[PDB]
C-alpha cells in the first residue's frame, strides 16, 4: 500500500539507465525488466514519461546530473 508504485531501488535503476541511453533498445528493456523486477510495459512507459518531462524542463534531476558530470 504505497503511492510510489516503483520502489526506491527500482527507481534508482531506471534513472541510472536513463542517463546512459534515453531510447533503450528492445533488448535493453528486457534486461531492465529482468534486473528491476518490473514489467516491461511499465519500463517502456516510464521512459516515455521521463522523456516528456525531459523536453519540457521538468526533469531537474537529470539537468543537475549533467551540470556536475560533464
Author numbering: 662 to 731
From the paper:
Zhx1 to 3 (zinc-fingers and homeoboxes) form a set of paralogous genes encoding multi-domain proteins. ZHXs are multidomain proteins comprising two C2H2 zinc finger motifs and five homeodomains. In transient co-transfection assays ZHX isoforms have all been shown to function as transcriptional repressors. Whilst many 3-D structures of homeodomains have been determined by crystallography and NMR, we report two ZHX homeodomain structures which contain novel features.
Removal of the His tag was important for crystallizing ZHX1 HD4. Inspection of the crystal structure of ZHX1 HD4 (OPPF_2265) showed that, in addition to the normal homeodomain secondary structure, an extra helix is located at the C-terminal region. The additional C-terminal helix in HD4 we label as helix V in order to avoid confusion with an extension to helix III, present in certain homeodomains, referred to in earlier literature as helix IV. ZHX1 HD4 helix IV is fully ordered although no DNA is bound. Helix V in ZHX1 HD4 is positioned almost normal to both the plane of helices I & II as well as to helix III/IV, pointing away from the DNA major groove binding site on the latter. There is extensive interaction of hydrophobic side chains from helix V and particularly the C-terminal region of helix I. Many of the residues involved have aromatic side-chains including Tyr733, Trp732 and Tyr736. By contrast, for ZHX HD4 the network of ionic interactions is disrupted by the presence of apolar residues: Ala668 replacing Glu19 in engrailed whilst Met684 replaces Arg15. The fact that ZHX1 HD4 helix IV is ordered without the bound nucleic acid ligand could be a result of the presence of helix V where its interactions with helix I may help to anchor helix IV residues. Helix V is also unlikely to directly affect DNA binding as it points away from the expected major groove binding site. The two molecules in the asymmetric unit of ZHX1 HD4 crystal are related by pseudo translation, which was detected both by MOLREP and from a native self Patterson map.
